[PDB]
Amino acid sequence: VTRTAAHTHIKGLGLDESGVAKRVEGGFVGQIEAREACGVIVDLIKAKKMSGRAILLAGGPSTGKTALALAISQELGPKVPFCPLVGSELYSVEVKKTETLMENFRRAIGLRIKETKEVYEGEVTELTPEDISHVIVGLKSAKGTKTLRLDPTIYESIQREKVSIGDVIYIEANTGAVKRVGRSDAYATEFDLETEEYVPLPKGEVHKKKEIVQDVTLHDLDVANARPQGGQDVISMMGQLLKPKKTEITEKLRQEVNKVVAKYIDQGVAELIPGVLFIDEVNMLDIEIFTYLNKALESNIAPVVVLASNRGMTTVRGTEDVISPHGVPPDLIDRLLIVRTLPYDKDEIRTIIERRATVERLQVESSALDLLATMGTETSLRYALQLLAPCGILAQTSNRKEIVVNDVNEAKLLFLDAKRSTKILE
Amino acid sequence: SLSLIAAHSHITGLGLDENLQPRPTSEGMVGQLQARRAAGVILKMVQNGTIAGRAVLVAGPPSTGKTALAMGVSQSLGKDVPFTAIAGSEIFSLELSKTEALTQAFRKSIGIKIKEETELIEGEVVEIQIDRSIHKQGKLTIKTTDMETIYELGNKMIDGLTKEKVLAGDVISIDKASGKITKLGRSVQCPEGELQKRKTVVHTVSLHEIDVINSRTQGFLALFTGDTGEIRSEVRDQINTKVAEWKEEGKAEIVPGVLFIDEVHMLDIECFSFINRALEDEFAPIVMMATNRGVSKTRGTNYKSPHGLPLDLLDRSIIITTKSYNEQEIKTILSIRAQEEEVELSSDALDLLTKTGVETSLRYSSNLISVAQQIAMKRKNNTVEVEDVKRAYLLFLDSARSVKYVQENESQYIDDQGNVQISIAK
Amino acid sequence: DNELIKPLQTRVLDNRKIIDTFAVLTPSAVSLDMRKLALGLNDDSSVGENTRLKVMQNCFEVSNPLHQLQTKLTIAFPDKSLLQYDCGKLQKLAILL
């Protein structure tokens, strides 16, 4: 029916209208101050005013940083672009790390545009070349007929689609795409056995016009203006199979794309939706990535980048003598606002385990749940969280629904923690 | 050019008078009197254009205004003059050698203005008459505010107009030499005079652009795709000698510009060795280098250096030093930032922000303005009061407080040796 | 060896059903003039007119096996099963018929 993941129970920040956070709402338990700070950040993002703002979710392991990031994404909604990332993802082999970082920057900035689509569809009644020459096609429908003159590219598309008289096609005027949807119903009984799949004759007028709103990113526009991306012509095929790999997009293309987007917004046909770039495990980044991130944040069109780390007084990768608060050099730290994330006591661990069990459709006895909570306190919260599924499997094998203490003990004896395995190694 | 608010949006110039003496607060810049005076000297040198291959080092402590100084220099220099700003981490590419990347950056900052005189007829079309072979007979009529005449077309003009399929009653533009046709809407606008006008169009290009244009059959796409590749040196020599010949002929002028490397402390010894010689030759722009580290080991070398740069390069540069701000300058900079961000701070709120910035950092207090504004908006208050800033301080941590928290709880974070105590118990 | 060795072209031809079923995505943004501008085949390119026309004619005459992939990734049509999914009356009418 449904699958469960690490953050399936996180539905939002659970903040009221005034901004104060309830103890248990939206799947969150505790972490009130961090939830309030993230709510303030969400309000800042919704303001759609500032650019390049950065915050750091600093805390130990298994403390609720990635959950906070996903909650921010949920609170903002699917309209805004939220780009998840890992520090290890920026070490590409086709293009340099700087280009990947810039591409992810522009992928987190959203644009919503309005476009009018001119669409033609009908049964073909004539295929006459004008003589690489234009084709004169006659489209018939249930409401009328129409005769059109198509450019040679559309002629090549029709030629390679094996369109003949009696076929029903679908020409999109804006993009020049031709799709053969099938053979007309009037010829269904012409032969008793042929591969043709028949379709009814289209209803309505041949020339149809609709207005659709589509969401794109600045990276989409950059890719569109940089390399050929589609088409049914051999020219497009050769253009895109030539220079296939990623390229280092220049600043000039980005500036021209920005000018185009400004023109679109000024005409009112487009609206801008700045979003969020989430870079988890930021300590994996090298000093060069941080150094360029310093410059990239100063750009006037940048998203609200959120960073997460779980390291303290660790040396920065690449450097050999720079000890930094979280593996982040002090130059970038001054550009950031740090949201501290605090550990969990026993009661909150117990409630988290209870809710995780409720989400995965498991039944846990109070005493067994207390034992699971105390062993999570003793060893680890995530360890207690992963023990739930083996306990449920063991209970099912004994024809028992609710989890009991004996099943938990058996699961503990089967699967071990890091400390126990290390002790066995010793 | 629509864009959001950056961290340097308020700096609209360098704020100098006629005698190059900077005012206490003008064009968005506050303080840094000697730095701004020296920057004005550099700006005058750039505008004169008679001096080539000068390197200026903008050194000083962090959060002092090095990038702000560069931005002010760029804005006061204005458009119609190249200004290339690249971070030192952008040189390291998998497709271009570091020397080639530096060469391309150097060429990008030298502009060439070429004037093209074109004969174009602009007016409102009235009638078009095209006939079959009797190769082709054609007459077009163009109306303007004070003339209405017919034109006897030829073969190629008829072919071009048929290809464009120009209608009637729409403003059209036809070039006599090139033959290009630019369509315009129906006459908001109207033709303004004689049918055939003589207006020159000026094209601003850089030496790098000419090099890339001549690099391949269709190299000008590489200015956007970025797949230029290491250009042959003979091509660059050809461009240089032709630019010298054009300047002698007077059909093209050169506009020297400024190249800005923000984080020179990341370039390796090979890059500095290349820069040393690249500065000497003609067509070398003015290179501005910003560094902060006092004494560090140059990348690629095992020895310290007076700025992270080899002594050979420092001998070739003049150093502009920036000094840390005091309380009043912090106050006025924060006021300028608040005015740019459209935030109405109170007097006591501004004083608290100033004391926080003096105690911790200017950037930290600058970032707190927007968070404080969002906090106040949650209370349905317009002006940001002291308590909003205090709540922002409580919710968001600075570098020193975060370090203090990490030091006091070093067990719960991952250290350099990779140890952490996830278990809340024991 | 004509059966042990199958080139990529015959694999494209033989896997028509899989390509039809699983090729769904389309580009977010396209620009039609870039298709010809990349190859230098625009009307005002530096390449000579005769060479441009010869290349265009050769492209017209050449055969490509990736045509189906191009047409699937250029335009996306809703699957026919969606009609059943959106009307329970049609769902039961199917089994009745």
């Binding site: 001119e118 033609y120 004008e130 004169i136 129409k146 005769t147 059109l148 003159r149 198509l150 450019d151 590219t153 559309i154 020409i171 005027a173 020049g176 020339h207 | 079309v125 009235v126 009638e127 078009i128 008459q129 095209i130 006939d131 079959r132 054609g138 107009l161 048929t162 399929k165 120009v166 209608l167 009637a168 009653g169 | 039609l32 003039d33």
Partner: peptide, 22 residues
């Protein structure tokens, strides 16, 4: 930019004549 699809009437459209007027 350019209209790849054009509407023509069989009786009216012919390449030998091009005409447009107010």
């Amino acid at each position: 930019m350019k209209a790849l699809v054009e509407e023509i009437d069989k009786k009216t459209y012919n390449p030998d004549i091009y005409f447009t007027s107010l």
